[PDB]
Amino acid sequence: VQLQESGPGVVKPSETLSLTCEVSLHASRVGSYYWSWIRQSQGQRPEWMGGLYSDTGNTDYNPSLKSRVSLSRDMSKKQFFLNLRSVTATDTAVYFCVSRYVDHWTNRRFDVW
Amino acid sequence: AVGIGAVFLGFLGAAGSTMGAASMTLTVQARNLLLTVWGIKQLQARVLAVERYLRDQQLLGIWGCSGKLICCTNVPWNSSWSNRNLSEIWDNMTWLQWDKEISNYTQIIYGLLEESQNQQEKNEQDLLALD
Amino acid sequence: GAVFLGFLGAAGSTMGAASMTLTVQARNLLLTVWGIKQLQARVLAVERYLRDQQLLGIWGCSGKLICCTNVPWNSSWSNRNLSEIWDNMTWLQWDKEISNYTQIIYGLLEESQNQQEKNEQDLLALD
Amino acid sequence: AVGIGAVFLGFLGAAGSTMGAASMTLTVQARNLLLTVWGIKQLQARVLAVERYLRDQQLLGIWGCSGKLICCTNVPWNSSWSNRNLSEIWDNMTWLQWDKEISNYTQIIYGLLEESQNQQEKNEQDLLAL
Amino acid sequence: ENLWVTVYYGVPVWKDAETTLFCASDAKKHNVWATHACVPTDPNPQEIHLENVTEEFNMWKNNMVEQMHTDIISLWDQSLKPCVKLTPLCVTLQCTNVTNNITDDMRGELKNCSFNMTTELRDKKQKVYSLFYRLDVVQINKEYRLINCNTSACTQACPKVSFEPIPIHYCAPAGFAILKCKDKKFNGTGPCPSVSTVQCTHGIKPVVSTQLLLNGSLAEEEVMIRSENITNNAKNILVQFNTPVQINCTRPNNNTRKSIRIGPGQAFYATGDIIGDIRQAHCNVSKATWNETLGKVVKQLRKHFGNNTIIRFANSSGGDLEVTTHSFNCGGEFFYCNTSGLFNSTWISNTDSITLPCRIKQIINMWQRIGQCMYAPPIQGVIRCVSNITGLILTRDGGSTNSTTETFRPGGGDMRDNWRSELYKYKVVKIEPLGVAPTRCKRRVV
Amino acid sequence: NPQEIHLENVTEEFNMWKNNMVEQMHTDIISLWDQSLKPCVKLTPLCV
Amino acid sequence: AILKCKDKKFNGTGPCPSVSTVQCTHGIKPVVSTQLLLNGSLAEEEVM
Amino acid sequence: TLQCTNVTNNITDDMRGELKNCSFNMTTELRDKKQKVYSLFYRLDVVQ
Amino acid sequence: IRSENITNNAKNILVQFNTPVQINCTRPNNNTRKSIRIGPGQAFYATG
Ligand SMILES: *[C@@H]1O[C@H](CO)[C@@H](O[C@@H]2O[C@H](CO)[C@@H](O[C@@H]3O[C@H](CO)[C@@H](O)[C@H](O)[C@@H]3O)[C@H](O)[C@H]2NC(C)=O)[C@H](O)[C@H]1NC(C)=O
Ligand SMILES: *[C@@H]1O[C@H](CO)[C@@H](O[C@@H]2O[C@H](CO)[C@@H](O)[C@H](O)[C@H]2NC(C)=O)[C@H](O)[C@H]1NC(C)=O
Ligand SMILES: *[C@@H]1O[C@H](CO)[C@@H](O[C@@H]2O[C@H](CO)[C@@H](O)[C@H](O)[C@H]2NC(C)=O)[C@H](O)[C@H]1NC(C)=O
Ligand SMILES: *[C@@H]1O[C@H](CO)[C@@H](O[C@@H]2O[C@H](CO)[C@@H](O)[C@H](O)[C@H]2NC(C)=O)[C@H](O)[C@H]1NC(C)=O
Ligand SMILES: *[C@@H]1O[C@H](CO)[C@@H](O[C@@H]2O[C@H](CO)[C@@H](O)[C@H](O)[C@H]2NC(C)=O)[C@H](O)[C@H]1NC(C)=O
Ligand SMILES: *[C@@H]1O[C@H](CO)[C@@H](O[C@@H]2O[C@H](CO)[C@@H](O)[C@H](O)[C@H]2NC(C)=O)[C@H](O)[C@H]1NC(C)=O
Ligand SMILES: *[C@@H]1O[C@H](CO)[C@@H](O[C@@H]2O[C@H](CO)[C@@H](O)[C@H](O)[C@H]2NC(C)=O)[C@H](O)[C@H]1NC(C)=O
Ligand SMILES: *[C@@H]1O[C@H](CO)[C@@H](O[C@@H]2O[C@H](CO)[C@@H](O)[C@H](O)[C@H]2NC(C)=O)[C@H](O)[C@H]1NC(C)=O
Ligand SMILES: *[C@@H]1O[C@H](CO)[C@@H](O[C@@H]2O[C@H](CO)[C@@H](O)[C@H](O)[C@H]2NC(C)=O)[C@H](O)[C@H]1NC(C)=O
Ligand SMILES: *[C@@H]1O[C@H](CO)[C@@H](O[C@@H]2O[C@H](CO)[C@@H](O)[C@H](O)[C@H]2NC(C)=O)[C@H](O)[C@H]1NC(C)=O
Ligand SMILES: *[C@@H]1O[C@H](CO)[C@@H](O[C@@H]2O[C@H](CO)[C@@H](O)[C@H](O)[C@H]2NC(C)=O)[C@H](O)[C@H]1NC(C)=O
Ligand SMILES: *[C@@H]1O[C@H](CO)[C@@H](O[C@@H]2O[C@H](CO)[C@@H](O)[C@H](O)[C@H]2NC(C)=O)[C@H](O)[C@H]1NC(C)=O
Ligand SMILES: *[C@@H]1O[C@H](CO)[C@@H](O[C@@H]2O[C@H](CO)[C@@H](O)[C@H](O)[C@H]2NC(C)=O)[C@H](O)[C@H]1NC(C)=O
Ligand SMILES: *[C@@H]1O[C@H](CO)[C@@H](O)[C@H](O)[C@H]1NC(C)=O
Ligand SMILES: *[C@@H]1O[C@H](CO)[C@@H](O)[C@H](O)[C@H]1NC(C)=O
Ligand SMILES: *[C@@H]1O[C@H](CO)[C@@H](O)[C@H](O)[C@H]1NC(C)=O
Ligand SMILES: *[C@@H]1O[C@H](CO)[C@@H](O)[C@H](O)[C@H]1NC(C)=O
Ligand SMILES: *[C@@H]1O[C@H](CO)[C@@H](O)[C@H](O)[C@H]1NC(C)=O
Ligand SMILES: *[C@@H]1O[C@H](CO)[C@@H](O)[C@H](O)[C@H]1NC(C)=O
Ligand SMILES: *[C@@H]1O[C@H](CO)[C@@H](O)[C@H](O)[C@H]1NC(C)=O
Ligand SMILES: *[C@@H]1O[C@H](CO)[C@@H](O)[C@H](O)[C@H]1NC(C)=O
Ligand SMILES: *[C@@H]1O[C@H](CO)[C@@H](O)[C@H](O)[C@H]1NC(C)=O
Ligand SMILES: *[C@@H]1O[C@H](CO)[C@@H](O)[C@H](O)[C@H]1NC(C)=O
Ligand SMILES: *[C@@H]1O[C@H](CO)[C@@H](O)[C@H](O)[C@H]1NC(C)=O
Ligand SMILES: *[C@@H]1O[C@H](CO)[C@@H](O)[C@H](O)[C@H]1NC(C)=O
Ligand SMILES: *[C@@H]1O[C@H](CO)[C@@H](O)[C@H](O)[C@H]1NC(C)=O
Ligand SMILES: *[C@@H]1O[C@H](CO)[C@@H](O)[C@H](O)[C@H]1NC(C)=O
Ligand SMILES: *[C@@H]1O[C@H](CO)[C@@H](O)[C@H](O)[C@H]1NC(C)=O
Ligand SMILES: *[C@@H]1O[C@H](CO)[C@@H](O)[C@H](O)[C@H]1NC(C)=O
Ligand SMILES: *[C@@H]1O[C@H](CO)[C@@H](O)[C@H](O)[C@H]1NC(C)=O
Ligand SMILES: *[C@@H]1O[C@H](CO)[C@@H](O)[C@H](O)[C@H]1NC(C)=O
C-alpha cells in the first residue's frame, strides 16, 4: 500500500485549496479503509484535519474547521480529495494523506504515511 | 481505537492456505454465496442458486447445527478414513487436497450425521417429556 | 438392512403411529412455455417451503422438527382424551376441524413466543 | 371465555410508537414479510423478495441469532454511535428517528458483529477441546 | 386437566389444491409435441401404497385435464408458429375432374386444380397444378377455391416435426403429490379403497380422436362405463375396454409430393400425380372380435341400466365432419372414416372383417376454434397403420319409451374427454407439513 | 472498480477448447444480433 | 467464481501458477473477423 | 388512391366539408381479384 | 392546486375540485358500420 499527495504547491490567498491523494489498495484485502488528512507546519506539531471511511463515506472534521474543510471520495478512481476554503498565511505546511485500517489476516495496524 | 477501518480477506483468498487459517474466512464466502430470453435465463440461474442454498441449509438443518458455521457433532471420527495426524492436516494441507482425498466417504458420512441426530433428537424428547 | 416407511406412508395411520416418520416428509418438501411453467411452479414450491420455515422460525422451532410450547391447550377446541385422540384418530380427521381454529392458535403461539423472548431478555439483563 | 375475540396490532401499526411499544410487534411484520411480460415481471419481483428475505436470514444466521427474533451479543455499545440514556431512548424515540440517527454506522456494527461471532465460535471450539 | 400444544413438521396431511404439473420423457429429433426442452424422466417411479386411508376421487372437475388440454394447445400453436404461412395459396382455382384410373367409389372426390401462384420474384407468376380433395374445396359461382379462403389463413406444419404421439409424464412439484386410485373397478366417482402416492404419472399419449379412443389405458378385469349423470341425455358416457381390439387403417394411393417456390425461402408441398391405380383409403376391424367387445359393452350397459331391456346402436346424428365421422391421425395424414359400419346392431335380453370407408382432408380444424386451421402436407408412399382402440364415447337419445329400446350413438363434442380416460386414476393434492397436537410436554422454560 | 483477488499457493488446471464461456458468448452474440434485427423492416419487395 | 490466469507465458492447457479470482471479466470487444484478429488483446511478453 | 367527393346529403353549414365519400379498389379474399368499394372518411383522416 | 413549483412558468398546474360538473356529449350521426372482406379472415369496418 502506497499513498501519494498531489496538488498545487503555491496558491494565492483567500480561495479554496484542492488536493488529491493517490491510494494504492492491497492485492486481496477488500474492505474499508480510513483516509485522513494531517498537516504539519515548520517547527509545529501536526494536527488532524479530517478523516473518512471508504465504504459509508461519513466524514469527521476538526473542531476549528467546520466552514473550511470539505472531504470527498470516489472509489472508481481510488482517489480522495481535500478542499480547504479561505486559505490564510498560516496554512503554509506539509500535507500528509494517511490510511488507517486493521488487517484481520495478520492482526497488524498498517499505519502507512 | 476510533480512527481505523475494517479490512478482511477477499473472496476465496485462503483457498491455498492452511485449514486453521481458512477457518476464519468462511463469512465472506457464506455472504457471497447468495425480449424475454435473457430474463428467463437470469431468473433460472438465480432460482437455481436459491435451491442450491436451500439444499445446503436443509442438509445442515437435519444435523445439530441450526445455522451456525462451525459446529461440533457427537459421532466419532473413523480413523480408517484418513489415518493421518491432525496437526499435519490442519497445518500442512489446504482444503482442496483434503476435499479430493476423502471425496468418496463424505456422502455416507452425511447419512450417519443425519440418522444419528435423528435418534439423538428423540433422546432429548423422551427426557423432555419427563417434565 | 433398514426399512422405516416411504413418502406419506402413514397417512391412514394413527397419531402415535405417524409421530416417528415425519423426518422423511420433512425433507420431501424440497417449448418455452413449459420452461416458464416449470420455473413458476418451482418458485411457488420454494416460496411455500420458505413460508413454512419462517413460521417455524417465528416460534421456538427454528431448527427442530419436534417442539412443545408453554401455552395451555384450550379444551373447548378438542374436548377429548389424550389416549383416545393419540391412539384412535388420524391426522386427516383432526385436520378436518382444526382448520377453523388454526389462525387463533398460530396467533397465540406468536405472541407467547414474543413474550417469552421478552422475559428471556429481561432475565439476561438482570443477570 | 367461549366468545372471546383476539385482535392484534396491524401491519406497521407500531411505526409511530416508542421502541418498547414496537418491540412486541415483531412477529406480525416477520410473518407479513413474505402474455409473457407480466408473468416474468411478477416472477422477478417474487424472486427478488425471496432473495432479500434469504439475505436477511443469512445475515442473522452468520451471527448468534439463528432463528430467534430477540438476541444479545457480548460486544459492547460504544458511545461514538449514539450517547443517549436508556430511560429515554426506549420511551421517547421511535424506530424511524433512531434508525435515521445512526444510519451511517450500520456497516461498522454489522462487521464488528460478524467478526465477534466468528471469534466467539473459535473460542467455543477451543473450549470444547478441553 | 391441562395440556400444552405441540408443533409437528412434515405431517402426512393434504388438501385439494391446483398447481402446474411438470414434464418427463425419455427419447433420442423433432416432434410437434414436447421437444428436448423437457427434463428427462426418472429411471423408476416412486410409487408408495397407502393403507387404512381412502380418498374421494372424481373426474370432470379436476384441473389436470384442463391444464393438459391448454398445454397441448399453447404448445401446438407455438409449434405451428415458425412454419410458412399459406395466405398466397387461397387464390382463384380452376379444378377439373380426374379420370385417370380412378375407382368408381371416388368419382368426384379428387380434383385436379390449376392456379397462378407467385414465385421467388415478386414481378413474375407461374401456372402450376396440384391435386385437392372435394371436402376442402368449395365452388364460387369450374372456378373453385379453398374452404378456408373466407376464413383466416393458416400455416403448413413443416415436415421437420412429426405428429407421433410421444408419451409424456406429468410430475408434481415440491410440496405436492399425485394420488393414484389402485381400485381395479373404479366407476369414476367416490372413495377409492387403495390409494398410492406417485411422483409422476404413466405414459399418457397425447393422441387426438373424436369417436374411438386410440391407444388408451386398458382395464384390469372388465370394461368400465363412466358418466357424470347416467340418467341424463347430455354428459357423454365414456366406456373403456378391458382388452384391446386392433384396427388397420391405410391409404392405398401412392401420393407424390412436389415443391413450389412461393417466394423467398417459402416452399409449398403440393400433391403430384398418383402413381398407379387410385383406390379409396379404408380401415379394417375384426368382425368377431368387435362383436365380442360389443357384447361385453351391452352386458355392462344392461347391468348398469335396467335389467332385461333391449338396446341398439346407431350412427352419428349430424353436425360437422369432426363429430360425424371418426377423425384421427395416421403417419401425419388426417383421416375421417365413416363409423356407420360399426355402430349398427341390436342387442336383446337372454341371447371375416368389416371394412370402414374413409376420406382424407388437408385443411383441417382440430378443435372448436374457427380462427386457426392447418394444411396437412401430403407425404409420399403408402400409409398403413395398425392401432388399438380401447374405448368409446357413446351418447343416448331423448324420448325414453318407458325405459325400453335404448339407442346409443357415438359422440365427441369435447376434446378433453379423450384425456379423461387416461387421467381418471390420478388426483393432485397439496401437502401441509405444519400440524398441532395437544400433548402435555410443554416448552422447557430456559 | 471490480474486485481482483489474487489466489496464491494454489494451481488450477486451465484447459481451453472445452470451456463453455465461448459457447455461451457465441449464443449470446447470435441472440443479440437476432433481437437487434427484429425492429428493422424486412426487404421482401426487392425480389423482382 | 471467475478464475483468471495471470501467467505471462500461459500455455494452451496446463496448471496456471498465478491464479486470481475476479467478479467480472475485463473489457472484451466482440469483433467479427475470419483470418486476422482485429483489435484483440495483446500478449504479455512475446507472441504465443 | 381514394377518389373522394363531398357529402351534401342534408349537410349543415358548420358540418360542411368535414366528411368525404371516398371510393377505392380494395383487395378481397381472392388475391387475383379486387373490388370497387365506397366508404366515408373524415377530413382529418385524409389529405390531398 | 397542485404543482411541483408554483412560481415556475413551464410547470403544469393541476386543479382538483370537490363538486363535479356533468357534461353530455352526443354524436347525432346515425352511421351504419359495414364489414369489408380484405383477405382471409380479415374484415375492415368502414362507415356506410
Ligand atoms: C503460502 O505458503 C507460504 C509458505 O508456508 C506461507 O508463508 C508463511 O506460512 C507460515 C505458515 O502458514 C506463516 O506462519 C508462520 O509460521 C512460522 C513457522 O513456519 C512461524 O514461526 C511464524 O511465527 C508464523 O506463524 C507465515 O506467516 C507465512 N509468511 C511468511 C513467513 O512471510 C504463506 O502464508 C502462504 N500463503 C497464504 C495466503 O497462506
Ligand atoms: C474412491 O474409490 C475409488 C475405488 O472405488 C478409488 O480409486 C479410483 O477408482 C476409479 C474407478 O473405480 C478410477 O477411475 C480412479 O482413477 C481411482 N483413483 C485413483 C486415485 O487411482 C478412488 O481413489 C477413491 N477416491 C478417493 C478416496 O478420494
Ligand atoms: C392399518 O391399521 C391396522 C389396524 O388398525 C394396523 O395394524 C396394527 O399394526 C401395529 C404394528 O404395525 C400393531 O402393533 C397393531 O396391533 C395393529 N393393530 C391391530 C388392530 O392389530 C396397521 O399397521 C395399519 N397400517 C398402516 C399403514 O397404518
Ligand atoms: C368449520 O367451518 C365450517 C364452515 O365455516 C363449518 O361447517 C358447517 O357445518 C355444519 C354441519 O356440517 C353446517 O350446518 C354449517 O352450515 C357449516 N357452515 C357453513 C358456514 O356452511 C364447520 O362445522 C366448522 N368446524 C367446526 C369444528 O365447527
Ligand atoms: C401516539 O402517542 C400517544 C402519546 O404518547 C400515545 O398515547 C398514550 O399517551 C399516554 C399519555 O400519558 C402515555 O402515557 C401512553 O404510554 C401512550 N400509549 C402508549 C401505548 O404508549 C399513543 O399510544 C401513540 N400511538 C401510536 C400508534 O404510536
Ligand atoms: C393465369 O394468368 C393468365 C394470364 O397471364 C390467364 O390467361 C388468360 O389471360 C387473358 C389475358 O391475356 C385473360 O383475358 C383470360 O381470361 C385468361 N384466362 C383464360 C382461361 O384464357 C390464365 O387463365 C390464368 N390462370 C388462372 C388459373 O387463373
Ligand atoms: C359411482 O359410485 C358411487 C359410489 O357408490 C356412486 O355414488 C353414490 O352411490 C350410492 C350407492 O349406494 C347412491 O345411493 C348415491 O346416490 C350416489 N351418489 C350420487 C351423487 O349419485 C355414483 O353414483 C356412481 N356413479 C355412477 C355413474 O355409477
Ligand atoms: C340426471 O338427469 C336427470 C334428467 O331427467 C335429472 O332428473 C331431473 O332433475 C331435475 C332437477 O334438475 C328435477 O327437477 C326433475 O324432477 C328430475 N326428473 C325428471 C325430469 O324426470 C336428475 O336429477 C339428474 N341427476 C343428477 C345427479 O344430476
Ligand atoms: C392434372 O393436370 C395437369 C395439367 O394438365 C397435368 O400435368 C401435365 O401438364 C402438362 C402441361 O403442359 C401437360 O402437357 C401434361 O400432359 C400433363 N400430364 C399428363 C400426365 O397429362 C397432370 O398430369 C394432371 N394430373 C392428373 C392426376 O390428372
Ligand atoms: C392388421 O394387420 C396385421 C398385420 O398384418 C394383421 O396381423 C396378422 O394377420 C394375419 C392374417 O392372415 C396373421 O396370419 C398374422 O399372424 C397376423 N400377425 C402378424 C404379426 O402378421 C391383422 O390380422 C390385421 N387386422 C385386420 C383386422 O385386418
Ligand atoms: C395392441 O394390443 C396388443 C395386445 O395386447 C399389444 O401387443 C402385446 O400383447 C402382449 C400380449 O397380449 C402384451 O403382454 C404386451 O404388453 C403388448 N405390447 C405392448 C407394447 O403393450 C400391442 O403392443 C398393442 N399396440 C399396438 C400398437 O399394436
Ligand atoms: C380501380 O380499378 C379500375 C380498373 O383498373 C380503374 O379504372 C381504370 O382507370 C384508369 C385511369 O383512369 C384508366 O386508364 C383505365 O382504363 C380504367 N380501367 C377500367 C377497366 O375502368 C380505377 O381507376 C381504379 N380506381 C378507382 C378509384 O376506381
Ligand atoms: C421555481 O421556479 C422559479 C422560477 O422563477 C425559480 O426561481 C429562480 O430562483 C433562482 C434563485 O437563485 C434565481 O436565480 C432564478 O433567476 C429564478 N428563476 C427565474 C426564472 O427568475 C425557483 O428556484 C424554482 N424553485 C425550485 C426549482 O424549487
Ligand atoms: C468503543 O469502546 C470499546 C470499549 O469501551 C472499544 O473496544 C471499541 O473499540 C470502541 N469503538 C470505537 C469505534 O471507538
Ligand atoms: C470404520 O471403517 C471401517 C472400514 O473402513 C469399518 O469396518 C468400521 O466399522 C468403521 N467404524 C469404526 C468405528 O471402526
Ligand atoms: C503423529 O504424531 C505423533 C506425535 O504427535 C508422532 O509420534 C507420530 O509419529 C506421527 N505420525 C505420523 C505418521 O507422522
Ligand atoms: C375418557 O376416558 C374415560 C374412561 O374411559 C371415559 O369415561 C371418558 O368418556 C373419555 N372422554 C371422552 C371425551 O370420551
Ligand atoms: C379458550 O379460548 C378463548 C378464546 O376463544 C380464550 O379467551 C380462553 O381463555 C380459552 N380458555 C382457556 C382455558 O385457555
Ligand atoms: C441521563 O441520566 C443521567 C443520570 O444517570 C442524568 O443526569 C441525565 O440528565 C440523563 N439525561 C437525559 C437526557 O435524560
Ligand atoms: C365432376 O364430378 C361431379 C360428381 O360426379 C359432378 O357433379 C360434376 O359435374 C363433374 N364435373 C365435370 C366438369 O365433369
Ligand atoms: C365461408 O364459406 C363457407 C362455404 O361453405 C360457408 O359455409 C361459411 O359460412 C363461410 N364463412 C363466412 C364467415 O362467410
Ligand atoms: C410409389 O411410387 C414410387 C415412384 O418411384 C415407387 O418407387 C414406389 O414403389 C411406389 N409404391 C408402391 C407401393 O407401389
Ligand atoms: C381390408 O379388407 C379388404 C377386403 O375386405 C382388403 O381388400 C384390404 O386389403 C384390407 N386392408 C387391410 C389394411 O388389411
Ligand atoms: C355377436 O355375438 C352374439 C353372441 O355373443 C351373437 O348372438 C350374434 O349373432 C353375434 N353377431 C355377429 C354379427 O356376429
Ligand atoms: C339381471 O338378470 C340376470 C338374469 O340372468 C341376472 O343374472 C343378473 O344378475 C341381473 N342383474 C341385476 C343387476 O339384477
Ligand atoms: C346413418 O345410417 C342411416 C342408415 O343408412 C343413413 O340413412 C344415414 O345417412 C346415416 N347417417 C350418417 C350421419 O352417417
Ligand atoms: C356411411 O355409410 C352409410 C352406408 O349406407 C351411408 O348411408 C352414410 O351416409 C355414410 N356416412 C357418411 C357420413 O358418409
Ligand atoms: C345395418 O345392419 C343391417 C343388418 O343386416 C343391414 O341390413 C344394414 O345395411 C346396415 N346398415 C349400414 C348403414 O351399415
Ligand atoms: C369540398 O370540401 C372541401 C373541404 O373539405 C372544400 O375545400 C371544397 O371546396 C369542397 N368542394 C365542393 C365542390 O363543395
Ligand atoms: C345541447 O344544447 C343545445 C342548445 O340548443 C341543444 O340543442 C342540444 O340538443 C343539447 N344537446 C344535448 C346532448 O343535451
Ligand atoms: C338509427 O338507425 C337505426 C336503423 O334501423 C334505427 O333502428 C334507430 O332507431 C336509429 N336511431 C336514431 C337515434 O335515429
- The C-alpha cell 346409443 sits at E408
Atom of ligand 18 nearest to the CA of D3: 5
**What is the torsion angle, in degrees rounded to the nearest 10, for the CA atoms of residue C71, residue C77, residue C80 and residue C83?**
-40
B96 touches chain G (CB under 8 A): no
- The C-alpha cell 382529418 sits at H44
- Interface probe for H, chosen from I27, I29, I31, I47 (most Cβ of H below 10 Å), is I47
- What spacing in Å lies between the alpha carbon of F20 and ligand 24's midpoint? 68
- Is B5 inside a domain boundary? no
- Is D94 inside a domain boundary? yes
- Measured distance CA(G13)–CA(F45) in Å, rounded: 52
- At E433, list the grid cell: 407439513
Which residues on chain B are in Cβ contact (under 8 Å) with F39? none
Distances (CA, A) of F23 to C32, E402, F19, F34, G23: 21, 75, 8, 17, 20
Taking the CA of residue F31 and the nearest CA in chain B, the distance in Å comes to 9
- Is B87 inside a domain boundary? yes
Nearest to H28 among I37, I46, I48 (CB): I37
Residues 38-67 of B with CB under 8 A from F: 38
Nearest ligand to residue E167 Cα: 11
- Measured distance CA(E388)–CA(E214) in Å, rounded: 6
Which residues on chain D are in Cβ contact (under 8 Å) with C35? none
A55 touches chain D (CB under 8 A): yes
- Is D38 inside a domain boundary? yes
b/e string for A71-91 if b means 16 or more Cβ within 10 A?
bebeeeeebbbbebeebeeee
Q: Report long-range pairs for B79-85 (Cβ below 8 Å, ≥24 apart).
A: B81/B105
Q: Report long-range pairs for D50-58 (Cβ below 8 Å, ≥24 apart).
A: D50/B50, D50/C43, D50/C46, D50/C47, D50/C50, D51/B34, D51/B46, D51/B50, D53/C50, D53/C54, D54/B34, D54/B50, D54/B53, D54/C50, D55/B34, D58/B30, D58/B31, D58/B33, D58/B34
- The residues with which E100 forms a beta bridge, in sequence order, are none
Contacts of D128 (CB under 8 A, 6+ apart): B72
Contacts of D7 (CB under 8 A, 6+ apart): none
Q: For residue E88, give the chain I residue with the closest CA.
A: I40
Contacts of H17 (CB under 8 A, 6+ apart): H6, H43
Phi, psi of B66 (to 5 degrees): -85, 20
- Is B6 inside a domain boundary? no
State whether the beta carbon of E304 lies less than 6 angstroms from ligand 25.
no
Q: How was this structure determined?
A: cryo-EM
- The residues with which H20 forms a beta bridge, in sequence order, are H6, H41
Output the residue whose Cα is nearest ligand 25's atom 9: E303
Distance of CA E90 to the CA centre of its chain: 29
Angle (CA) E209 E213 E215, round 5°: 105
Q: For residue G22, give the chain B residue with the closest CA.
A: B11
Chains that touch E (3 or more CB pairs under 8 A): B, C, F, H, I
- Is D6 inside a domain boundary? no
Instruction: Determine the number of helices (DSSP H) and then strands (DSSP E) in chain A.
Output: 0, 8
Which alpha helices (H) appear in chain G, and where do they start and end? none
Atom of ligand 2 nearest to the CA of B105: 27
Q: Determine contact, residues E175/C7, Cβ cutoff 8 Å.
A: no
Q: Residue E48's closest CA among C28, C52, B118? A: C28
- At E323, list the grid cell: 363429430
Sheet containing E195-198: give its strands across.
E14-16, E426-431, E176-181, E195-198, E48-50
Phi, psi of E139 (to 5 degrees): -75, 165
DSSP-derived pairing of the beta strands A59-61 and E282-286:
unpaired
- Is D74 inside a domain boundary? yes
| Helix D37-61 and helix B37-61, axial crossing angle in degrees, nearest 10 | 30
Taking the CA of residue H20 and the nearest CA in chain E, the distance in Å comes to 30
Q: For residue H31, give the chain E residue with the closest CA.
A: E91
Nearest to D44 among B26, B39, B69 (CB): B39
- For C41, the domain range is 8-124
Contacts of G21 (CB under 8 A, 6+ apart): B10, B11, B12, F4, F5, F7, G1, G2, G3, G4
State whether the beta carbon of E339 lies less than 6 angstroms from ligand 27.
no
Q: Determine contact, residues B103/E416, Cβ cutoff 8 Å.
A: no
Angle (CA) E410 E414 E419, round 5°: 95
Burial classification of residue D87, based on how many CB atoms lie within 10 Å of its CB (0-12 exposed, 13-18 middle, 19 or more buried): exposed
Q: Determine contact, residues C23/B120, Cβ cutoff 8 Å.
A: no
DSSP assignment string, chain C: ------TTTTSSSBHHHHTTSHHHHHHTT--HHHHHHHHHHHHHHHHHHHHHHHHHHHTT-SS-SEEEEEEEPPTTTT-S-HHHHHHS-BHHHHHHHHTTTHHHHHHHHHHHHHHHHHHHHHHHHH-
Resolution in A: 3.4
Contacts of E70 (CB under 8 A, 6+ apart): none
Phi, psi of C95 (to 5 degrees): -65, -25
Question: Inter-chain contact A76–F5, Cβ cutoff 8 Å?
Answer: no
- The C-alpha cell 483468498 sits at B13
- Measured distance CA(E302)–CA(E312) in Å, rounded: 11
Q: Determine contact, residues E163/E206, Cβ cutoff 8 Å.
A: no
Nearest ligand to residue E398 Cα: 8
- The C-alpha cell 447468495 sits at B34
B27 sits in which H/E element = helix B26-32
Output the residue whose Cα is nearest ligand 27's atom 7: E340
Contacts of E204 (CB under 8 A, 6+ apart): E167, E168, E169, E170, E419, E422, E423
| Helix E63-80 and helix C32-58, axial crossing angle in degrees, nearest 10 | 140
- The residues with which A39 forms a beta bridge, in sequence order, are A47, A95
DSSP-derived pairing of the beta strands E406-410 and E311-313:
parallel
- At E428, list the grid cell: 393432485
- Whether there are 3 or more C-beta pairs closer than 8 Å between G and D is no
Which residues on chain G are in Cβ contact (under 8 Å) with F25? 30
- What spacing in Å lies between the alpha carbon of E217 and ligand 25's midpoint? 28
- Measured distance CA(D14)–CA(D96) in Å, rounded: 11
Q: For residue G22, give the chain F residue with the closest CA.
A: F4
B12 touches chain G (CB under 8 A): yes
- Measured distance CA(B74)–CA(F26) in Å, rounded: 52
- Measured distance CA(D98)–CA(B22) in Å, rounded: 38
- The C-alpha cell 437435519 sits at B62
- At A68, list the grid cell: 473550511
Which residues on chain F are in Cβ contact (under 8 Å) with B35? 35
SS3 readout for I1-48: CECCCCCCCCCCCECCCCCCCCCCCCCCCCCCEEEEECCCCCEEEEEC
- Measured distance CA(E96)–CA(E142) in Å, rounded: 7
Q: Determine contact, residues A67/A85, Cβ cutoff 8 Å.
A: yes
Angle (CA) A38 A44 A50, round 5°: 20
Taking the CA of residue D5 and the nearest CA in chain A, the distance in Å comes to 48
- Measured distance CA(F42)–CA(F32) in Å, rounded: 18
- Is B3 inside a domain boundary? no
Instruction: Count CB-CB contacts under 10 A for residue E311.
Output: 20
- Measured distance CA(C41)–CA(C45) in Å, rounded: 6
- Measured distance CA(E73)–CA(D55) in Å, rounded: 40
Instruction: Determine the number of helices (DSSP H) and then strands (DSSP E) in chain H.
Output: 0, 3
The pocket around ligand 2, CB under 6 angstroms, is made up of B 100-104
Distance of CA D72 to the CA centre of its chain: 12
B82 touches chain F (CB under 8 A): no
DSSP assignment string, E146-171: ETTSSSPP-B---TTS------B--B
Question: Inter-chain contact F48–E122, Cβ cutoff 8 Å?
Answer: yes
If one counts the domains in chain C, the total is 1
- At E269, list the grid cell: 408441398
